[PDB]
Design a protein around this ligand. Structure first.
Ligand SMILES: Nc1ncnc2c1ncn2[C@@H]1O[C@H](COP(=O)(O)OP(=O)(O)O)[C@@H](O)[C@H]1O
Ligand SMILES: Nc1ncnc2c1ncn2[C@@H]1O[C@H](COP(=O)(O)OP(=O)(O)O)[C@@H](O)[C@H]1O
Ligand SMILES: Nc1ncnc2c1ncn2[C@@H]1O[C@H](COP(=O)(O)OP(=O)(O)O)[C@@H](O)[C@H]1O
Ligand SMILES: [Mg+2]
Ligand SMILES: [Mg+2]
Ligand SMILES: [Mg+2]
Lengths: 156, 370, 370, 370
């Protein structure tokens, strides 16, 4: 679908919040994490213009900057069964994510978000967009089983 | 009315065409919290823009969306522009054509994207991208002269004669205020002062702006500083601690004339200006020698004009008259020129209209704008 | 023969040039009694130094004269040097040139006062102050490479190519073993082990040296610790009590790669190394990538070399060959390099002589030393 | 035997007369370290020449002693020649007549200094200074034809008929590979790639050498590039970074045919060759049209011969047969011709001998040579 699409490597690192802020009582794990993925998916300038404009429309629709648009997309994906076009777009974007040259690092960031900020606290009930993005980074889908936690009490 | 937004690397100078000074001047930074929690109703706002980020600087991680005159974080740049239009100017961008600036020899995708955002995200009726050096000449009122524009990200000089630019003679150095700021915090460690955070980098920038100056003769100034304490100045940090700096006052600006201080192989701004003039036609060099116009914050160091006068005079033939024009409104020369250009009746046909963008796309900027 | 004294924030490594290992390696601490004695003939010594202070730490307040590579208590540093020369090496300092070491980007007054004490208090015939990262390369035997030196107080990167250092690319990070020790104290309170006082900071330093390690994948290690309990290990305190430590084993060293968890805004050592390389000339980066030399005690964590290799490989372009050099003697590599340098025939003209000192004062150190 | 040293602006081609290819080919650069210190005992030198300068290019400042065919730094040129004779050819210049080459219409002091240094410094028994365009004809084996020699410094045309040059018809443009390298550096910034150092100029030179080509129809190629990415090629920098280059591949060599790209008020090489032929006698133009011979590295661009055939054919009358002779070894054609000339028995009485020089002085070169 998007041949010749290239990304500037390490462009998304500056967008990852500090672990201390991930523990904030009003931290928005979904929006902040999707911001990292949006930044990581920003096409490199070396990509041909037709592909850039084509892909920029895909990620702009699926990973919008505006909170109003992001929330509207979230609600519209709750009944994704009635929105095949989003199904195709989300499927297309997930295909791009799984081929991202730095998918391993993005997977580590996603796991850090789940570990610290509770990104995947809903487990299997995660919204369609966030679940698809994670499935792209984590192919097996094991993240649906939330992070393992220490449970200090009753320790041997 | 037309909006003039001089989105520099360090500061955003925005206002309305026809005014004498920008209405809004705030830092071009987006700060996001880096600490934890912990109070209900006190952390809903993620990211702060401009002066608010500077005020809450202590708990944020500040980041400039523009580096070396190139927009590197377009999501943050969108936040900066949204802050400018709606929060600082209190205008609807869809009702005003917007003139904005950029440095010469920038990546073309930089102009293309900013054209794309202005038309598709803000629905501006029309827009224009001007060269900052050219606007400075508009502000000075001349039609001939070699401008030396040095802001936070990039320093460049554009030789213009009788209104004609010599694009083969443009110069660009990625050595500007921010590079000087970084050097100052590096040489401040020699006195035991450690500034490492982005919040503290702003304090070092304030120290630079308040205390740094250009020595007329560097070697003599170094000897004077070594031999006596007359050049030492004290500065009070936000928490009450007092720091004193001696030769660091003029060593930091000296990097402009000696880029090797920060490991750069390039030549000083004095020699780059002379090289730019030497690349121009021999018949116009005399006029350029007499119309070196400074603009940008990085040219606000005390004694910079006298140093540039001395350095170029030693390079140019002795029979030329070297004149440095450094207006007190140097720091806003670019915005003033943009305001002049935007309000010119003969300029109203040079806008990129929304209709033109629709037919041609973001590539229209390369045809309509220098 | 010349003396090589690697002062260091945590340990004093002292010996003679030409030997393969330092003669004396003792803590850089000075202990003052806290309690009342209280017998006749006991406790007439007002202070204890090095191993003696460590042995008697139960009734002593231990204090490090050097903090973050900077000497903060010069009277105590004089005690340590007096102990090193007279009680550990058993030499008359007036006969032997002394090679000293310090981190880059230190305050100038630190090395100025080092010279003054050596020439006046100890009357050494000559001395020299070397940069620790440079010496580590001497020990490795290479002429090119970027050294990551991480001791107790300072972690700094120095890229060197063909014997030429790129000082503008030198990165310094005030996060080292002592900061990791303090963090281990903090997270050990999550369990019932509340050292939480300055008495037992050395016991948890020993715990850190014995049990802590760097996880190749932090998330996988955290999951394994949460699930299995197979990573739990037990440590016996001097009291005979046994503390069990689980994921704190690899969480404490994780602060090196995530300077957060201690509230630092800087990037991890992997990114600092990469940033240092990217500040260098593009033509030497390939050689730097293949010559990542690690030195200092803080690099002795099991798996840190593997972690550094993985992390830098993720930052650098895929075609580059990343290679971490981690000698088994990297804890003493700095002293070994000092020994090699001090014994070179070509180095015998680089000493700062007593005649040169009193002719020029402590400022001579800046001219003759990097 | 005789030495043939074709030291152009960019490369030094040296060897023995009678050989089919130069023995030593290396860049005409002197590099000097621009960084500090720091390791004693290392095999460091105060300057590096030729291939060694390229190897250690990362930590050096590279200077070309020759620019636009004129030697501007004679001290550097001396060590370039010393490097050629002693370290590359491994000969004693005292016992070898040495043939040198230079471009037409050069300053006479250039030839005089070249002669003076060879006889006084290198004490050669005899020497001769030939014109590069003439030598190319020797290599081609002809005695008639108009030679277009384009190296790193200068492009010149020399029409020759039956061995007779028409010096009033000789053309010389100071536009050659180095100007193309600088232009490629400038237009690469359009894509965000920034090369500013002398070391990085060599990288851009390599990109130009192995990616640029001449477009048969410039406007058609521009449309093709704008419409598709088929013309885009990737190049891996020394640090593993990959740069993608599109229409810049042919826009750089297009400067040869449109000097206005770099602000030069001059005719392209096609028009200069045509203008030269028209300055010749009408009776020889037909043979000149059919014997356009290319030489020099700057003529190695793919498709340049076809472009020149197309361009001149559009200028010359339709009945003339335009033939561009572009041998595969036209990069070394000048040296090959010099080797042929120096090995001719009929040429042996045309050397400037040491006895001749000491009697007449450096000015002898103006009488004995072209
Ligand atoms: N009075 C001053 N003295 C020295 N430097 C100054 C002064 N005022 C501003 N600067 C420097 O100039 C820069 C801002 O210049 P400006 O023209 O606003 O650049 P930009 O157009 O990129 O915002 C800052 O980085 C600051 O360090
Ligand atoms: N085997 C080890 N594992 C982990 N940390 C260690 C080990 N050995 C020493 N360290 C740490 O290294 C520090 C001392 O390193 P060193 O290179 O001596 O620093 P300095 O040169 O400043 O004395 C101590 O704080 C200690 O905690
Ligand atoms: N294959 C090639 N394609 C394009 N340009 C080339 C090629 N080979 C060499 N050049 C250019 O030619 C110049 C060297 O040509 P040369 O004939 O050696 O000049 P000189 O005689 O001054 O040494 C260099 O500047 C280089 O950029
Ligand atoms: Mg500006
Ligand atoms: Mg150490
Ligand atoms: Mg040539």
């Amino acid at each position: 679908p998007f041949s010749g699409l290239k990304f500037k490597q390490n462009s998304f690192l500056s967008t990852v919040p500090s672990v201390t802020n991930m523990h904030s009582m009003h931290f928005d794990a979904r929006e902040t994490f999707l911001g990292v993925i949006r930044k990581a998916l920003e096409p490199d300038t070396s990509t041909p213009f037709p592909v850039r404009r084509a892909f920029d429309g895909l990620r702009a629709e699926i990973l919008p900057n505006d909170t109003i648009k992001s929330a509207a997309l979230k609600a519209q994906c709750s009944d994704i069964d009635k929105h095949p076009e989003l199904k195709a777009k989300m499927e297309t974007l997930k295909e791009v994510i799984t081929h991202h040259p730095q998918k391993e690092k993005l997977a580590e960031i996603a796991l850090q978000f789940a570990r610290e900020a509770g990104l995947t606290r809903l487990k299997g009930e995660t919204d369609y967009v966030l679940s698809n993005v994670l499935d792209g980074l984590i192919g097996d889908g094991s993240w649906r089983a939330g992070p393992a936690y220490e449970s200090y009490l009753n320790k041997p | 009315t037309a909006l003039v937004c001089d989105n520099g690397s360090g500061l955003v100078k925005a206002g309305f065409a026809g005014d004498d000074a920008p209405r809004a001047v705030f830092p071009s930074i987006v700060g996001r919290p880096r600490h934890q929690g912990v109070m209900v109703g006190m952390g809903q706002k993620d990211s702060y823009v401009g002066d608010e980020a500077q005020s809450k600087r202590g708990i944020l991680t500040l980041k400039y969306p523009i580096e070396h005159g190139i927009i590197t974080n377009w999501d943050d740049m969108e936040k900066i522009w949204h802050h400018t239009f709606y929060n600082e100017l209190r205008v609807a961008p869809e009702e005003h054509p917007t003139l904005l600036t950029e440095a010469p020899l920038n990546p073309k995708a930089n102009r293309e994207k900013m054209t794309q955002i202005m038309f598709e995200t803000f629905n501006v009726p029309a827009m224009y991208v001007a060269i900052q050096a050219v606007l400075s000449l508009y502000a000075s009122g001349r039609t001939t002269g070699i401008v030396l524009d040095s802001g936070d990200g990039v320093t460049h000089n554009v030789p213009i004669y009788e209104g004609y630019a010599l694009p083969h003679a443009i110069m660009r150095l990625d050595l500007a205020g921010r590079d000087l700021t970084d050097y100052l915090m590096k040489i401040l460690t020699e006195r035991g002062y450690s500034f490492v955070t982005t919040a503290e980098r702003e304090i070092v920038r304030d120290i630079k702006e308040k205390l740094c100056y250009v020595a007329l003769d560097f070697e003599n100034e170094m000897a004077t500083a070594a031999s006596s304490s007359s050049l030492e100045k004290s500065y009070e940090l936000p928490d009450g601690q007092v720091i004193t700096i001696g030769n660091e006052r003029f060593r930091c600006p000296e990097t402009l004339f000696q880029p090797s201080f920060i490991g750069m192989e390039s030549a000083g701004i004095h020699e780059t200006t002379y090289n730019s003039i030497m690349k121009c036609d021999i018949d116009i060099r005399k006029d350029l020698y007499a119309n070196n116009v400074m603009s940008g914050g990085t040219t606000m160091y005390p004694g910079i004009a006298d140093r540039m006068q001395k350095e170029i005079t030693a390079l140019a033939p002795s029979t030329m008259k070297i004149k440095i024009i450094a207006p007190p409104e140097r720091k806003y020369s670019v915005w003033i020129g943009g305001s002049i250009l935007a309000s010119l009746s003969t300029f109203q046909q040079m806008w990129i209209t929304k209709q033109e963008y629709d037919e041609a796309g973001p590539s229209i900027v390369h045809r309509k704008c220098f």
